[PDB]
Write a protein that binds this DNA or RNA. Structure first.
Lengths: 83, 131, 536
RNA sequence: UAGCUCAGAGAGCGCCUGCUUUGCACGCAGGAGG
RNA sequence: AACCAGGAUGUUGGCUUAGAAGCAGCCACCAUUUAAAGAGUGCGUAAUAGCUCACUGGUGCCGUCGGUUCCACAUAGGAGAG
């Protein structure tokens, strides 16, 4: 699955278009490398995300194409927040 | 030869064209019909008229139509639009017998009961029924 | 409504009943609302935690609202971790709309363990979050919050818990030292100074009019538990507090406990809100169609003003007919005396014979007359819908929710919308009679046609919109005749009216004449006016 | 295939309108669910 | 069959209609004087008049940028204008 689609179904972003935008601004890295909106993402990958000043690092735990709302938070885990 | 209400014959719509095509002065004649007729205008009167070539207008008032005498005695506004798919009013034979006596000078029946039978035939035309 | 001062009140009155309480059963009857059954003081009773955005509260509650068929996802964790658990403490957490429950529990081998449950009552984003008291990890929350919202806090399972930001508002003379003489809207400045308080409390405080005594009275009265549990009605809107209300113009009612206040305020809220939404959504629809029908007559009436005067083509046809013996083929005009004696120069067709000219006016007359009769019957149909929707909007404005629940069926049956014994609602009447009525048209029609014979006396308003009402088959005393008018005026073409007459008739008339138009004969009317709830 | 995109009859979502509005685009209910 | 003569009376049946009088439509379809004659067979009229006949006698995609005329049978070359 793509990064933008993963951020959307995991409910890290509300609108898929903004998930695409944030990745296309280069505000996302996978496994330390900068990542494009199309980037493949799998469980056991590291994501770093620049939400304004808040540099959040998360790891993916699961993959899905659809979910119930609470179950979306089950998809991934944080590991650090910085700013 | 016309049918017009008793009194108020002077308005042009019924009589005016018929006198017109004969060349007769309406307001010369209709004052005399309004003189000879004194019953209420709820009664239509048939009037016979003729002109000489000299335009001597001449006339005779006849007895009212038997269908109008029936209407008055039946107490109805107008006859049945579909007799034998409706009826409108009932009357005593004594009134029909007076109508026969009234219409007799304007009829070809020799006997009162033949005239009553004519008048009830007129009643059958219009949904009036008989006791 | 629910406030930091109210939060303090709850934190104490719950600890009067829930100290050392065993949590015997947890269930989630509604999306954002969770029930704990708790055994404490030897008694088995219910605590409601709610993070519904409008109605969020913490609330010990009498009503067994429902218990779910589902075991939903947050509820199951609270059943796993704090059902069978022991409530140690309840705390106000800085007083501004947060409560903490410290709770004892055991692990799957019987080691002793301690959990913090945080209920945040922060309005549109209230939330309920469970946490380990030693590690500070969120186990889960009733709402998650993904860090892309970029708020000070993240709410995710397994992450460390945190309290919301303090506003730099001081914990409760010093306000007179902050306050500015150029500030109106003073409740804004009071809420900006003090923690634990919200605009209705600050607005009633301002309406006490300097005000230091007012604020020092309030904060002491609250700390001392001196308050009254109170509900109020302010025309349509209704509010509640643990307070006397200083200068609010409304009605008032009081109780022994905050539990009964929160019960009596919220128990009807879901239905009152659901109905007022759908009932206004029906009102909006009927207004569009009633406007469209009134605009259809406004169209047709000014359109009919361009019809010819059919009487003139009639009169010309007659005039030519009567003159016809004099006229000649193809003169351009006929000078004709009207049958008062004016002369009309009637224009002729130059090729038609004078007979055909007479027939031509009778044909134009027949077109004109036909067209006017056709547009009048369009107007008749639109008038039926205008009148029917005037009556319907009278009813809809004055109907109970239960009677609105009849009205929609008639309009789906009326095809305007898309998809059993009772009819009347009834109340006491003079000479000790019982009087029936119905606010829904089909129910009123089914009541007036069948509650009584033909020979009985039955009633309505004399205005062109009403509700139909009667005592059953009655011929009751002149006291009943004088009382019926007050029920009719509680449901007439206008509310609160000063002189709008009542009408009463023998039920041999009041038969059927759209729905619910009745034929009037055998009838009387008396002048009358609107009245208090004593009209029951 | 619910207004929409998809899963099998139920998940997610948008719009519009109401409600709620001491807290940093955080909700809720209705248009309605085939 | 032809031909001569009669072919009527209440009545213009009721209604409907501007008119609707046997003959635009609907409903009825009686009765009288009779040798016989329909509350009328087709023409005729604006409605009537008028001629007649039964009859009688004779001879991508969703939405107001956002959101994944009368008639079954149709033709003045003269008011004038030609």
């Amino acid at each position: 699955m793509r990064l933008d689609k993963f951020l959307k179904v995991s409910r890290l972003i509300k609108r898929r278009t903004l998930a695409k935008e944030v990745a296309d601004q280069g505000r996302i890295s996978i496994n330390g490398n900068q990542a494009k909106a199309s980037s493949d993402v799998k469980p056991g990958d590291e994501l770093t995300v620049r939400f304004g000043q808040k540099l959040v690092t998360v790891q993916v735990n699961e993959l899905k194409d659809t979910t119930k709302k609470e179950e979306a938070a089950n998809m991934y885990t944080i590991l650090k927040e910085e700013k | 030869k016309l049918q017009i209400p008793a009194g108020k014959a002077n308005p042009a719509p019924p009589v005016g064209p018929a006198l017109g095509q004969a060349g007769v002065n309406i307001m010369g004649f209709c004052k005399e019909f309004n003189a000879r007729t004194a019953d209420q205008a709820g009664l239509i009167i048939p009037v016979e008229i003729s002109v000489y070539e000299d335009r001597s207008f001449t006339f005779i008032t006849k007895t009212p139509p038997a269908a109008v005498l029936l209407k008055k005695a039946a107490g109805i506004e107008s006859g049945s639009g579909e007799p034998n798919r409706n009826k409108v009013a009932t009357v005593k034979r004594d009134k029909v017998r007076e109508i026969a006596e009234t219409k007799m000078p304007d009829l070809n029946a020799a006997d009162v009961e033949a005239a009553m039978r004519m008048v009830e035939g007129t009643a059958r035309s219009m949904g009036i029924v008989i006791e | 409504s629910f406030d930091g001062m109210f939060t303090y009140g709850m934190t104490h009155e719950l600890n009067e009943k829930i100290m050392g309480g065993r949590i015997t059963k947890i269930h989630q009857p509604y999306k954002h609302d969770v029930i704990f059954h708790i055994r404490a003081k030897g008694k088995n009773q219910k605590l409601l935690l709610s993070a519904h955005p409008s109605y969020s509260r913490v609330h010990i509650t009498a009503q067994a609202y429902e218990n779910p068929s589902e075991p939903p996802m947050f509820c199951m964790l609270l059943r796993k971790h704090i059902e069978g658990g022991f409530i140690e403490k309840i705390e106000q957490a800085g007083l501004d709309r947060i409560m903490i429950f410290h709770i004892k529990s055991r692990n799957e081998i019987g080691d002793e363990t301690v959990r913090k449950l945080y209920v945040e009552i922060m309005g549109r984003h209230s939330n309920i979050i469970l946490t380990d008291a030693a590690e500070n990890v969120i186990i889960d929350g009733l709402k998650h919050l993904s860090p892309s919202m970029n708020s000070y806090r993240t709410v995710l399972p397994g992450q460390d818990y945190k309290l919301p930001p303090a506003q730099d508002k001081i914990s409760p003379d010093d306000i007179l030292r902050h306050l500015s003489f150029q500030e109106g809207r003073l409740d804004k400045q009071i809420v900006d100074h003090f923690s634990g308080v919200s605009p209705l409390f600050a607005k009633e405080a301002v309406h006490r009019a300097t005000l230091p005594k007012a604020l020092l009275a309030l904060f002491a009265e609250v700390k001392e538990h001196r308050f009254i549990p109170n509900i109020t009605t302010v025309n349509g809107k209704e509010y509640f507090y643990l307070l006397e209300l200083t200068h609010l113009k409304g009605e008032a009612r009081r109780f022994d406990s905050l539990s009964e206040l929160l019960d009596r305020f919220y128990f009807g809220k879901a239905e009152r809100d659901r109905v007022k939404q759908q009932a206004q959504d029906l009102e909006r629809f009927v207004v569009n169609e009633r406007k469209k029908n009134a605009n259809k007559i406004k169209k047709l009436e000014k359109t009919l003003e361009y019809s010819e005067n059919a009487k003139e083509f009639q009169l010309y046809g007659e005039l030519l007919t009567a003159n016809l013996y004099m006229l000649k083929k193809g003169d351009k005009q006929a000078e004709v005396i009207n049958y008062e004696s004016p002369t009309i120069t009637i224009p002729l067709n130059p090729n038609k014979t004078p007979s055909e000219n007479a027939q031509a006016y009778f044909t134009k007359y027949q077109k004109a007359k036909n067209s006017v009769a056709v547009v009048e019957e369009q107007i008749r149909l639109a008038q039926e819908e205008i009148e029917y929707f005037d009556q319907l909007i009278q009813q809809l404005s004055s109907a109970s929710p239960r009677d609105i629940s009849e009205i929609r069926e008639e309009l789906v049956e009326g095809k305007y919308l898309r998809p059993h014994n009772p009819v009347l609602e009834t109340y006491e009447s003079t000479s000790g009679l019982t009087i029936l009525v119905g606010k829904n048209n089909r129910q009123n029609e089914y009541l007036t046609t069948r509650v009584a014979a033909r020979d009985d006396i039955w009633l309505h308003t004399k205005d062109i919109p009403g509700s139909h009402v009667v005592i059953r088959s009655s011929e009751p005393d002149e006291q009943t005749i004088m009382e019926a008018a007050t029920i009719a005026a509680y449901f007439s073409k206008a509310k609160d009216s000063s002189s709008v007459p009542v009408d009463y008739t023998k039920i041999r008339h009041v038969k059927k004449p759209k729905p619910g138009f009745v034929t009037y004969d055998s009838q009387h009317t008396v002048f009358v006016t609107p009245d208090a709830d004593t009209v029951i």
